[PDB]
Symmetry: C2
């Protein structure tokens, strides 16, 4: 049973791109991650959409033991103004995620 | 640019699984699709989340126009109680797609 997340963040003014770079870097080679997508929002220059698919909720929890994940949080937190949305989902079908 | 969609809908009561089947069948092998994910919501047994990543908005439009995609939309309609959220996004980076 897979595990999904859908989140919307707002960066502090002018920091969207720096935060996006931190997220993308931080998300490489996390065991059990099937997809991780960071997106801008055309309607809001400060917003970031993050969508994630994991093989299990266990893999997502375990990912916090990764030094690179910890660094991304350390470096990223100062740039976060808000987390407006955060939805846990159960992916059941689809394409193009291996 | 890449083009993303994040959508939430609710099926008519009890019809989530049948609607999900239609969505997953409908979205088969469309060209320029990098990611397509259909998901349940543990807090609402009728809810469905859809996320999509395309290599361009043009590829999205080209695939959306395939008769089989349109057929899926048509077959799905009676099973849809409501379309709740629909966000267009600009994916810029990530992994596994």
């Amino acid at each position: 049973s897979m595990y999904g997340l859908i989140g919307k963040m707002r960066a502090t003014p002018g920091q969207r791109d720096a935060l996006i770079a931190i997220l993308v870097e931080g998300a490489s080679s996390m065991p059990g991650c099937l997809s991780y997508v960071v997106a801008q929002d055309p309607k809001d220059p400060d917003a970031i959409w993050i969508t994630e698919v994991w093989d299990s909720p266990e893999s997502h929890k375990a990912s916090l033991s990764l030094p690179s994940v910890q660094d991304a949080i350390a470096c990223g937190r100062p740039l976060i103004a808000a987390l407006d949305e955060h939805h846990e989902t159960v992916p059941v079908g689809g394409h193009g995620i291996g």
